[model samples]
Target: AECSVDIQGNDQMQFNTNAITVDKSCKQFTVNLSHPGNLPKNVMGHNWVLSTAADMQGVVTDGMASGLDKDYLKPDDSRVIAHTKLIGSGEKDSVTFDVSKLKEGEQYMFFDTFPGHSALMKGTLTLK
Candidate 1:
């Protein structure tokens, strides 16, 4: 009902929601992610991450490094608009970001950083 969205990840290496829209009136936005599968984080873990379309490949490449200890993300990566911590099966995590960081027409995406996960778990985000 507010400026937020709920998403789910499962053992299938997937994110249930494919896209997100942020209302123009919202001052901020929030993302809630939960894993519905029974596997542990080491295997089927997931995280909600945001980035620009141009930097998606860069972010994903670095995200593949260092494993889950860094939450599958490069430390202090400036390319990341906003991101959440990695969560395992039946766990949950959330991220909040200012609306100003996003542009009305700039391309953005939501993705997961777990190994072999980005390709299957990604979505577009738009500010409207």
Candidate 2:
């Protein structure tokens, strides 16, 4: 089986975990995001976006104006490595990426790109 992990977000603007590990043996990796709150997506929604630690800020900055309809992500942004669909309470989303894209020592970050949520819902991702 391929490497996979589950993450969660709630109304408090928090994610269940801050870090994830991807195994080198896997050709691909998957991230599953679940929203367990009762709020609607537009208000307390969340989406997972992957990028280099260096590219995160710029991606978030450009995504700010993209709005909820665009899942707070700029269309065709090259900085993004992978991303899940924007989801709300009781909804789920997932995304998979090629493991070869991840470099061993390079810092990668995963976070909710829903505006202010990034500050509280971000974490580091590593390969081993």
Candidate 3:
């Protein structure tokens, strides 16, 4: 089977673990985001947003206007390579994007779009 990674987000605005590698051999990569806390989406919601390391800040800046209903990510935002749907505590969301989105030598990053959460909810993603 190809490689898939699991990530846990909690009420504390952080990912349970950091540093996940995306295997190059897989034609597609999947991110499984689970909220294992009791907090509501408005308080501590989470989503997995992926973009080039350099584009992360810009994406976040623009997404700020999109609001919660839009998952804090702008619709049709080209900068985002892939992302999981927004989810709340006791819920989970997953996304599978073609490996072709993973560029060689380029570092990818994932983060939660909830306001005030990205600071701790971010991590590096690399394709190898």
* Clash statistics: count for each candidate: 0, 0, 0
Q: Of the pair 1 and 3, which is ahead by lDDT?
A: 1
In TM-score terms, candidate 1 sits at: 0.97
lDDT of 3: 0.85
Tell me the whole-model lDDT of each prediction, alpha carbons only.
0.91, 0.91, 0.85
Q: How would the candidate models be sorted by TM-score, starting from the highest?
A: 1, 2, 3
CA displacement after TM-score superposition, residue 120 of candidate 2 (Å): 0.5
Clashing pairs in 3: none
What's each prediction's TM-score?
0.97, 0.96, 0.95
TM-score of model number 3: 0.95
Model 2 CA deviation exceeding 4 Å by range: none
lDDT of 2 by residue, 8-124 (tens): 999999999999989989999998899999999999979899999999998888888799888888888999999999999999988989999999999899988888899999999
lDDT of 1 by residue, 1-128 (tens): 36999989999999988999999799999989999999999999799989999998888899898687898899989999999899999899889999899998799998998888999999999899
Q: Give the CA lDDT, 0 to 100, for residue 97 in model 3.
A: 91
Q: Residue 43 of model 2: what lDDT?
A: 93
